[model samples]
Every structure is written in structure tokens, then in C-alpha cells.
Target chain A: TGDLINTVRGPIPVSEAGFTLTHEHICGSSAGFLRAWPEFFGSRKALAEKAVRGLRHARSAGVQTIVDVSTFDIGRDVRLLAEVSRAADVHIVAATGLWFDPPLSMRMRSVEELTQFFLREIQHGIEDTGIRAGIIKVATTGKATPFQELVLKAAARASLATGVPVTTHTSASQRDGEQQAAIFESEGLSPSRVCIGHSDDTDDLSYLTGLAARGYLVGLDRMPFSAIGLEGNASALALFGTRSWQTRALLIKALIDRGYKDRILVSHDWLFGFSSYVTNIMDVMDRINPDGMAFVPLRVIPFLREKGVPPETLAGVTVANPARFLSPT
Target chain B: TGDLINTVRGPIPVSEAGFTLTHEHICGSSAGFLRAWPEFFGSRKALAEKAVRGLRHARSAGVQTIVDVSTFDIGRDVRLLAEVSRAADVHIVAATGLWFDPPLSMRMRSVEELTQFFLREIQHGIEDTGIRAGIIKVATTGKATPFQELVLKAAARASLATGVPVTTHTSASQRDGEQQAAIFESEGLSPSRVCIGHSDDTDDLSYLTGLAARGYLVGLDRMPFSAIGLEGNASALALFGTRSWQTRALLIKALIDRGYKDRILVSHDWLFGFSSYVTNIMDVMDRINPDGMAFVPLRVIPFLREKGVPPETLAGVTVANPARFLSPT
Candidate 1:
């Protein structure tokens, strides 16, 4: 079974994606925000430089590929991503999916019709950029709202139709990953192709273990943030707040100890540019780790190594897991 | 015959438009810009306040209607426009058309397909805003490129089908209005339904006269900038340079003397918010007139009066002409 990974530039062999960052953003602003004030995003030369710097830094740290899950609803600039990829000389795999909310035009579309929208981007290319999406991302609000369910179903169908893997943003506290897994399975998607994102936000080991046992990939993303005030305080209270990275690391260690290392994907959920609501997540992160993407390779991995997590387990989560989950079956 | 004009809020009798500003932008930023940095556009409450202030000032200055010709390519926010129109209590007639450059998705569309796109907005509503467009705006680059021609023809078809008037942007120095007229005529459209905008950018009296003789509404829209420095100067001969306001006023006086007052439309092409490339034309205009929309009603009309132009001619150009041009045939 051979699979060629589709990048923003073009298709490349899966093996070439040496150390892929499964979830990251080169530029992520909402479509509403971009429509309102374009000049403030800075000139293309300036924005490209900002993205190039981060990507080049990651490249120097041995990051071969970055899957930018910046969907269309969240200002997914395939053209700009392609520009940054070429400038930084890195393979960027872009996504075709909606963010938290669907726009009015798409809200009117049925699941089948919405599936076509994703399939078109996957089969052909996004707009006229000739850059195909390598992944499909979907998000669920707390407890899975009706609108969010529609997007999940569509993303499920689109993923089954195209060989592209489906990544999801779940309310970890609400245990929505269980619902997402059920939806994907009902829609005929293999659990291996479905990734439950932001699982590290909660310390509920049972929920995380349940998802792993069902063969769904658990994303230990958002690892760069502080873990100072997050652990041992609120267990099942607020399902939305991000728990400390310390708690996330312990959860990952437990999962790997249980021989489920291959079902885990690690990322920082590092936002490089302006978001619709969040101004700059990097500005906040720089307060914690000045090296940015280097924090993962330098700080997080070293900490896990000191914690006695085996090298093979670390490689499985960081490298091989992303490759196998992202590669077409 | 009584006619109703479609505004962002709803329909209004044409007679309610006591004094209309023919070409203005309550909100205008390129789609590319909005997609680049949406958060910078600010919150809805803040943006709405910015628009409301300008419209309220214009309303207090005797402007009853404002035709916001912010095409879709340039962030035509019908929902925001509707909000501003309601808050300012002014009739805002929105447009459905393309700008000088169409987006990639629109570029691939055939003329018939593009025609339907415009027709849907004009006949029904834009997106799910429930606000129908009252006018169609189409633009051409210098001498009209092939793509511009396609938009012009589609706009003409949409206009004829919807009974909405067509307004256009022309490279006045190159006298592209002649070609615009020819294209509209070729599509079996009456010249009366077409308005050739930016006619004042040229000092050539014959070119303005030719468009008027063909029964087209002539727009002497740029009236707040310099004159002596612009007449014989290549200091800004970039082909799209705006000529002086003094020359524009003189051209208007000459047209009025020739009994073409009813065919004339006067405006400042005043912009309230960010534009496609320029952040705010108001930033440049702030040096000339601090009163904003009030400058046209207070200064320009009074300046024309001081120069011995008849009061009836000013009333005809400012009041009756815009009403007649914007009304259904």
C-alpha cells in the first residue's frame, strides 16, 4: 500500500515528511476579520517574512512538514502558505474544513453538498491556487452543538470519500471526543483516520484511555503553555479550560506505558499569526518559551526524556505516528 | 409613475431620496484584505459606530440617501450596511457587482454564470442578509481589459434584467467611458441606465459632453482635491491619477451652461472606512475637509454658488439627477 502525501506545493513521498508537526498555523485569522481590515495584516512581504522566520526556525530544528489546519472559515490562505513553504523550503500540508462556525452561505448547504465542497478541494485544488488540502479539520463546541454535529458529519463523509485524515477540535472536559468517535464510526470512517484534538486539555485519564482503546489518535497538542495552576484542582468541573502541560505530559506518559504510543500525536498548536478573536498566541507563548517551535524539540522532549519515557515511544508519538495517521491507507 | 427604491433595510419610495450622494463607500476594503486581517477591522459595535457617525453627519447635512457602491470584491458587508442604515436613519442603496479585478472563483465563471451571480443579489438578497441590491457597479482598468469587459457585459445583463441602474469606474485620463458606453450599447442596454463615473478626472470638455449626449449620467465625483498643480502636470501621470477639484467644478459649470444639468451627478467619492489598497481615503481628505460628508453640502455647493452658477443648476445636479438616475425605468 503506497501513499503520496499532498503538500501545499505538490505531492511528495510520505517518507520525505521527516518530523511532521501535525497541527500548527502559519497564519490563522477569521474570514470575518480579514474582510474587515486587510491592511493591518501587514503587506504580503511582511506577513510572508513573519511566517518564513517561524518555519525556518522549525526547519532548523528538523521539522520537515507542517500541517496547517487553518481552515477557510479561519482565513486559510493556501496561496500565502505556498509562498511561505517555498520561502522557508518546508513542506506545508494545508487543510480544507470549516472552523467553529459555518458561514451563512455554507449553513444553507446539506451534508452531501458540503461533502462535495471538501471533496472538490481534496480532489482538485483550493480555489485557483492549485494547492490541494492534505487534511480535513472539524471542531465541536462544548457538548457538541447541533451546528457542530453537522460539520462533524460532513467532515466524516468527506474523509471517507477522500483518503484524507480527519482531525477534530473537541471539548475535552465535556467528553465530546467519545461522541466524535461514535459519529465518525457511524459514518463508515476507520478510527485510525479520525484524530481527537486537544485531548491534553483535560486530565481525565479514563476518557483519554477509552479513546486510545477504540484506536482513535489522541492529540497532545497545546503543550507550550504553563501548567502551574492547572493540575489536581478541577477534575470534572469546567471541561473547556486548558490544563497545565505538566498534567498533559503525565497523561501522555501513562498512555505510552500502556503500549498505545502509536495512537498519540504531539504538537504545540502554535499559532504563528493573528487569530479572529485571539490577537497573537505567540506573544503569550514567547513569555514562556523564547525559542517558539524549538521549545518542543528542546524543552518538552528533554523533559519527557528525563521522565524516563523511552526514545522509541517518543519517536512513535512525534514522528512515525503522524506519518502513519496522515498517510493514505 | 411611482417607483420604490431597494435599500439595505428595505424598499423606500424614490421621492424619499431628497438629496442623494450617488457614489460613496460606507465600508469598503478588498476581500483579500479582509481575509488577511479580520480582527483589526474591530468589533461589530466599533465598526458600526464608525459608519453611523459618517451617515448621521451626512443626513444632518441634507443628504437623505447614500448609494454605497462597495462591490463584493471590495468587502460589501450588506449586514453591516443594513445595521448602519437603520442606526443612521438614512436610505442606503447597496450594489451588486464586481470591482476592477474579480476573485479567482469568479474569474473562472462564464459571463452567464457571473450574470446569475449578480442577478441573484439584485433580485433576491446578498448571502442571508435579506438585503437586495438596488444598483449594479462594474469597473474597468485603463482602456478596459478583457476581464473588465466580461464584468461590464454581465453587469449590463443583470441591470437590464433587474431594472437597476449601472454605475461604472473609468480611467478618465484615457477616456475609457467611450468604450464603456459602447459595451453597454452592444448588450442592448439603454445609455440612460448607465452612469460613467469619475468623468471629472479629465479636463477634456468634449469627452464629458460626448457621454452626456449619449444620455449617460456623467459623474463629476472627485471635488475636494487640488487644481492649479493638476492641470498641466505629469507629476502624477500614473494613468489613474485624480485631477484637481477646481477643474472638476469648472467642467461642471461648462456642462450646466450647455443645458446638460439634468444629466449631471455630483459627489465626492467620499470613503468612510478602509478601501482595497488604501487604508482610508479619509486620511488623505482629512487635510482638506475635517467636516467629512458635511463638506460637500456646506462648502462645495456654496463654493459653486459663490462662483455665479445658478441655484437651479446646483439643485438639478445634486437632487433631481441622482433620483432620476437611480430610479427604475
Candidate 2:
């Protein structure tokens, strides 16, 4: 067991980690996503303040730490995380490994090279920032690209080499986590050391249970969802994801009932800003998850509590589970 | 009008471009589409022979000319197109400009530079093959990226500079053609000179009618479709496209009924092969469109005829309209 858990603020005692959002983003520059809508971003200072304000609100609701899963392609900036951590008074864990589309260098490199690239960030630090990544992150769609599979194996290799845990972005709508779990399994990565993210995007409890039974920490991480139906392309709702925080809260309660609370992690996959239209995005998203990160802590827990979930199981998911998932002691 | 129409086999009399399919790929290297399935590729020789057989079959159904919409990103090879042209005894028109994705060079270049590049292909030749392009191609998703917008403008500029026609690949499911049409409209490209491809993917007659009203030759492409419901992601049918060839055939009949037959063009989007799993892809796709490119002529037309549409209206969609759209006098 390690004495310290690494974060953007450098190493802190594992015990000090406290309550953590297993997967969240402070800021992002995902080209396609930022470009997905018109005027989707705001200024850097706007995002910094927005993220700080949101984290402060969550902190008021008992949140203590957050795992920032943004990797290179999603505009992972250790400097921003370090600064945001200080301002928000929260421990922000940064990650190594690619997310979203792998760039040309990632595509052309051998898997061994990709592993080494991530290893450097996990051990030495990201760029020259001296802010080492606390965890490994990789992603895949319904069908993983050949390079996506390579990146998955690379993240597994890096996680093994550095004794760090791995988190993944998935097209969970298609039970994408099933394939991701297998690939990690192929790399000899223990499912316990992995958090299969976006499981909330699906209502398929069997899929989530399969991953959970395999010992994977299921990440019900997307706290803010616009009430289903992409206005113009409303038909996308059936294939993409479900609406309602109540549905996700029910999934949480069911997991607790099934005795897998220890294998569950939760967070908002929300970002403070993506590209310069913070005002626009925030207004659109405001009604959906009004208190931002606090939606889960304040609304979800209370709702689950009303549904007869004991405080201990909820605490295990919010605090103890994340700490153990991070430290594994 | 010019005395001749340019094709991969070199310029032939404009009158010789009969029974033409406006938007079809002889073959494709679309990384995403080919990689979208498991073991979804076959060998080059396998693709070549398969393409020849399909084209010969279409030829027997009276397809005289086929515009291969494949551009650089789609594995456009002049040599392959020329060879296929000879083997199938069909006039194959090759395209200039980008189709699927704009490369690094395209991303960094000024619109003027991109325009000049496509213009050179139209005026001189593609690569060193000396196979001059007869048309310019551009594409967009539901929303056009900045680069997609730039490419649209570039294709417009190239078409304006070389007096060639334009065809576009669209996420017609989202009425992507509307935005592409507008962008080209902004660039001063004549709507009559632009054939909006994949309008068949949508049943939105208003969208199709709007494009036709704007004078765009509506491309009712994608003839070879597996019965709706992407076996695994079945719900995708709602957002992606529809179930029946009858839907598209009925769309054709509606467009004709609306007195827009002169603006209609049709084709199969089936590739001879994608990677080395030609047999696999063919076996899966066989029952859906058993005759490949001939599906439009042999099945669709017969169905329309049984619906009591006259031969001349069918002739305009299959033969006359494409010739006029390809070579406007």
C-alpha cells in the first residue's frame, strides 16, 4: 500500500483523499465535442472561475476530491488542474493516456511506444509541469478502433507498470464496457483496478452488473444530462442515453441492494467549459443539473436515502470506495 | 457546352454518357465505414474482381456511366478507376477534392490554396496518373466543421474555376445537405451544378424538396442497404436512416410526382470490397441488394413502372438527368 495518493497538487496521504468524484473534468478542449455545438466554450478565466465555483458548491455538499480524467486529446492541462485544485479547495487527480481521437503520433506509434509515452507521464510527469498523472485513462466507441484497442492495452500496461488504476471512456450505450473489460482482462489488469466509465448512459443493469461482478468499479459519472432527445435529432435518445437523474439514482440504489456499492463510483462527467460559450452552455445545462456537481451529493443521495439506502452504503460510494480504488491498500 | 464529357477513360461525346449513376463509389477506403464492422475488409484483387462483376451486372441493366464519388481520403486511385472502366466497359467519371476527411495539409491550408489544389486536379490530373477529374467532391456531417465549410467553399471555387460540376456527401439523415447547400450557396456555386448526395438516407421530403427547389440535383444514393436495424444498435435506425428500399423508391416516386424528376439522380453506395472480408461483406449484403448497382434499374424502376410511372420519366432519372447535370449546356 502506498502512503500517498498522487494528485495534480502532488502526493497527499491516502487517508487525506476523502470523498472523491471518480471521473470528472475541470476543463476540456475536445475538438469534436467543443466543435459539436456552436459557441460551446468560454474564456480560460471564465472556465477557471466556473469550475472553481462548481467545485466549491460540491464541497459545500460534502465532496472533497475529484479525478480529472481529461487526457491529452481532451485538453488535459495540469497547470489548470493545479490552479483549479487550489482555488476550489479540492484535490484534483490528473490522468495519463489518450482520450477521444488519438493524434497522428499516437496512431503511428507501436503499442510499446504508447505504453512508454503514458509511463513517462505517470512517473516523470506531464510535459515539464512536474504534475504526474494519478491514474491512466483510455477510451473506445461501440467498436474500438484498432488504435483504440492498442491505446487500451497501452493504458493497461502503463497502469501495471506504475501501479496506478485505470479509468475508461466508453460508448456504454452499446455495452462498450464489456469489450473494454475484456481487453483490460487480456492485458492481465485486475478489474478492481479499473473503473468502467459512462455506465449511467445505459439502463441495462445486466451489462453494468456483468462489469461489476467482474470486480470493475462501475462509473455512473455523467450527472448532468439534458432531458433526453437532441432537439433536432430527438430520435437519437433511444440509441444514445436515457433521461432523468431519477433513473440513475435508481440504478445507484439497485447496485447498493445488489451488494455492489463498493464496486460503484459516481461523478458528473460535466466540464466547466469546453470551447468559449460558457454562458450559452451553462444556461442550456443549468436546468438539467442545477447545482452542477452537487446534484449527485445533494439530490441523488437524499433520493436514494428516501428509497431506504442506508447512509453507510452511500458513504462507501462517495468516499471510502473512491479512496480504496485510488489507493488499493 | 463542351463537345465531350470527361471520364476516367478520357473524354467521350457528352451524348455517350447514358444510364448514369451520379453518386457511387467503385471502391472505398473510408477508414470508419470499413472499420465499423468486424473482419469487414477483403483483398485488393478480390475487390477488383468483385467490382468488375458488379459493374458488368449493372452494365447488363443498362448502366452506361458511373461516377466514382471516391476522392483522396476514400482511396481514390486513377489507375484503379481506369482499369475498372475498361474491365466493365463503363464510362467512369473520377472526382477531385476531399470526401470523407480533409488531411493535415487540407486543415492548415488557406481556402484559396485548397481551391487551387482541386482546380489543378480538374484542369490537369490526379497525382501523376493524367486522369483528369470530371467533378469536384466535398462532404459534411450533420454540422459542417470549419474545415468542411472550407472544403465546400474550395470545391465551389474549383467548380467555378474549371467549369466542372460538384457532388457532396452528406449526413442526409440530419438534413446535412441543407447546410452544405447553403455553404455552396454562399460561395456562389450554381445549385443546378451541385448534386446533393445521400438524400435517400432521409425520408424528409421537405428537406429533399427544399434542396431540389434550390435547384440542386438531389442524389438518392445508398441503394444497397441491409434491412434496417443495425442488428446490434437497432435503435440507430430512427436517427441514422429507414428500413425499406421501398421507402427510397417511394421517395423517388414522390420527387417525380412533385415534378422534380429532372433534378433526380440515383446510385448504389455499395463498394466492391472494403478491406479483405469481401466474401463476408457480400454474404451479409447479398439479399438486400443482390444485383448491386443494378438494383436501381432492375428492381426500383420495375417497381415504379408497376406503380404506373412512364419509361421516359424513369429514363430521365437513370439516363438524361445525370448527363445534363454532369455536362450543363
Candidate 3:
């Protein structure tokens, strides 16, 4: 009855998605969030329906694995997530940590408590749901944002305890990606196991390129954001090269050209629609904006029909790269 | 002989424009360009014909003002532009500027020489032809490349000398507007007299806000550049409100809310039939990609109508804003 905590939703039907879109959110909310922002509540019934629709959409789109990056104060949607993952026949990856923003109980807590919370979740489960998280998440806003620094610190401790790889979301347009890496480096963390998130959105070339060059996997997963305006879409397509199948290959080529091939990783930061803007009405996004991508392999494959993106490069971005990332170090 | 310098065609007929695109180019080659790239000799007739076809299609789109930002190296197409402008009455605004980027002869010249070379042609006639320029143009390639900086200094100097306003292209995500504004500011150039072009492409909020706050006019033009992907299109529209007309009005409202009423401007960056890797060609863009704000004011206006955006806001983005931007300080 507390913020619809006891409500039951779907174990949706999903299976064998072609390209796993990691970093997605089905139904994610914080534990103490309800007590703080009564205005930011979610409806379990609506979220469940969104789950059903999202699972269907993911399956149709051939996305095989879904990584949910919700942390402690924000990730109590486990029951809904597991059910949807199972129903969709897709592997559901979960995380245990803290978000980069504040005004929540987690952010206000001591680092020791947050670390204990993440470790406890890793060792057992949160509130006895029993489903385990697949990876760990750390986050930072530029200027360290005080509380966000705590999240990063806690993430480090949890990773050392659980041996899980860590992923991060940075502040907009800040060299937060580099600053995060610097923190990890200072902590003596293995660069290979850490993923720098949202590296594509910035205009800072040298920093991003340097981070990738330093061996940390650079996440270029925000695929839907490449296009800017109308012709911007076409120009974006052209930038990705003329063929559909060439997306990954083109990405690899761009990376290789920029001397950042080894550090490239791919994922989709799909928020399952309106989770932020629409509150509980998430499924409406599909109705408003549909995709023209010809399905996973098809969308980029036709363009590769003649241009011939090297099989190895394509496989690396689509298969090997993500698989290794999900398993973590 | 030199990349068709004598016949650079454009000023496509607005009546024939399918989408009524407002910004585009057909011929833009520096005098030094042919001299530098000697292999491009004797390519005039073909280039001219290609440009003719570019206008023919734009005319077909029923477009009106194809504001050509081709002042520098605008080819030797005065008659061609006049012909297209007259036949189509597309209301082409021909631009003039000492293009940024070194190795150009004008770049090496003194400020006085540059101003005289530019103003005489714009105010009087180029050689024997009476064709005159209408707008000043400059471009910045996001990173504040050395060439761009030098060009900005020269453009600012030229503006001071000729009393002509200047508009610039800045993209690839540098804080171009801010950078250009700073240069102009140092020269005592008022914001109203200078345009920080393509300021909408980046998500750098603070930077854009700073530019707006500074009173410098900016172009949210190129609404068709869906570089963030198309899924955000309706939502981008939705930011205005729920209904179509309301949404557009709200977009203008948001701009006004930010107090950029006089500073706000709109453009399609539409290069109708031109081969564009940056903005992308318009025709195939509709079917292949289909993203960003297409220049169909009729359809887009309805969305704005839903948001209750006043016709004045629409006029600001479409007519008044542009006229003011084009006006001298």
C-alpha cells in the first residue's frame, strides 16, 4: 500500500533479442523516494502495462539482454523487472549502488552505510526478493556534486567486495567521463572492467579519446540520439555511412580512425518511454515516435550488403564486446 | 574553367520548393581553391548544370526564401542567382564574408585590404557585374580551430568597417556561439548585429543560455537536423505542449520564457538538392531517415497552434526574427 509497493505486474514474454539494449529501465524507483517527492510517484498498474508493451517491443526489435542501472534508492522495481525479463525471454541485468542525484535518503547517508547496503544486496537480496543484480553502478556529476562523489566511493567498495565491474553516468557536457576515470585510476581500479557511460554526447574530443585510449571501455550506446534535426537524421545516417548494416562497422572505423578501437562498447540507454517525462504513462512514447530501423541485423545489414563491414569488427560491437561487459571482471 | 566559378547556380524558386527550405547552397568555391586544387580545373559547365537542377527541385518544393550562406567563394554565379531568384522569387539572401580557415588568399591579407575587397563588391559591383551581396557570413567548426578564430577576428573587423551584419555557421558541438560572441564583443560588436549560427545542435544548456543572456542573436535554425534521432521529434514538439499548434506555440513560448524573443531565430539549414554530408540532402531524407523539424510551416504550425504559441512567435522564428538578424546594427 506504500507507494503501491505490494502491486503485482507481468513476468513479460520476451525471447532471444538480437542486439541487447543494455541500460534500460522498466520500472525503477528509489526506496526512500516516495517519502521525499510525493509528486514523483509511479503507478504499479500503469508500469506493469508498460512492462508488457516494452517487453513486446524489445522482443520485436531483437534486443536480447536488458541491463537495468537503477541503484539502491532508485532500484526497488526488481519484482517487475524480473517478471518482464522472464516473460520477454531476455536476460535481465540489474545493478546495486546509488544514483548521482540527491534529496533522497541514500544520498544523505554515510558512505559506510551505502557501501554496506550495496554489499548486502550483492551478497543476498534487497528486502528478500532474492533476485541478484548482474553488475554494479557508480555515478558522478561534474564538480563531484558532493553526494555523487559518495556514490562513486560506495561503488568502488562494492565492486571490491563483489568483484563486479562498474558502470557510470556522467553529468551533461562536463568532462565527467574523464573525471570519473581519474577517480577510478586513483582508486587503482582496473580500467578494463570499468565502463564510461554517455561518452558520445560531448564535444570534448581529446578527453574522451584519451579515456578510451587509456583502456577503459567507452560506451557509445545512445544510438537513438545520433540524429539531431530532420536532415540531421540523414546526415547522421551518412556519417554512419550509406549502408544499414554498417552502423557498427562504421562505429569501429570511426574509433579506429580516432585511435580508440579497443575501448569501444555499445548499448542503448532506453528508458522504456516517459519514465521521466510522462510519469507512469511510459508506453505512449511508441505511439508518438516509432523507429525506422529495419530490425537489428537488417537495419545495418543491407548497407553492409556490398560495402562489407569486416565480420570481426561487426561481431566485436554486437556480440563479444557486450557479452564480456555484462559478465564483468 | 575553375570548378565553374563563373556559373555557380542557386537562388532556387520558392514556388517550386516542396518543403519551402530557407537555407541552402549550390556553388561555393574560393578563388584560391581552384588554384590549390589544380585537378579541379574545367569543371564549370557540369557544376553549373548540377546547380541548375538543385534550383529546379527546390522550386518544385514551393519554397520561398532559400537564404544561401554562400558569400565566401559563392562562385561566379551572380547571373545564375539573379536568374533563379527572379524566376523563382525564392527571396534568396546572398551572403558575404572572409571565410575562416587559413591558406585562403584573403586570410593572408591585411584587415583593410580584406574590408575593401569585400565591401566594394557588396556595396558596388564585383569587377564589371553589378551583383551585390546581402548578408555577411562566417563559420566555426565547434573546436575553435585556429582557422575559425582568425576568420572571426577578420569577420568582426570587416563588420566594423562595412557596417554590415554578420551570420556564422558553428557546429560539431563547440560552444561556437559563445566563442564567436566573445570575439565580436571584444571588437565592440553588438549582439544584434551578429548571429551565432547553429547554436541549437549542442545540449550545452549553460553555454547557450549564456549566449542568449548576452543579447547575441542565435539560430535554432536547421530544425530538420534530427541529430538526436527521430524518436524525440514528436516529443521535441511535445515540449511545447500536447497538441500540435500548442506544442509549436509552447516552443516559442519557452524561448520567450527564456527572454530570447528578439534574439530567437529559426531556419531549416535546408540544402534542398545539394549533396550534403553535414546537413544531408532533403528528398531522400524524408523516406530514409525522417527526423528533425521539417520546414513545412503549415504542419509544424499546427503543432505550435496546439501549444497556443502566438503567430507573433511564429513570425519571430520565421520572418521578423530573420529580418532583424539580417538587419545592420
Q: What TM value does chain A in model 2 reach? A: 0.91
What are the DockQ scores of the candidates, in order? 0.02, 0.02, 0.01
Task: Identify the runs in model 2 with alpha carbons over 4 angstroms from their true place.
Answer: A31-40, A226-240, A276-282, B1-147, B150-329
TM-score of every candidate relative to the true structure: 0.54, 0.53, 0.42
Tens-digit per-residue lDDT, A1-329, candidate 2 = 35678898899988888878888888655322221121224446666787899999989998889999987666566777898899989999988888765534345556886787788778877756778888888888788988888899998888887779999988887898989988999999999899999888888999999888889999998766645645553423433355777887678888888889899998888777643222234455665566987878888889988999888888888888888888832
lDDT of each: 0.76, 0.76, 0.53
- Give the per-residue lDDT of model 1 (tens digit) for B168-262: 98888889899999999999999989889988888888998988988999988766655243445442223225555566678788888887888
DockQ of 1: 0.02
Docking class of 2: incorrect
Give the best candidate by TM-score.
1
What's the lDDT for residue A153 in model 2?
Answer: 94
Worst 10 residues of 2 chain A by lDDT: A31-40
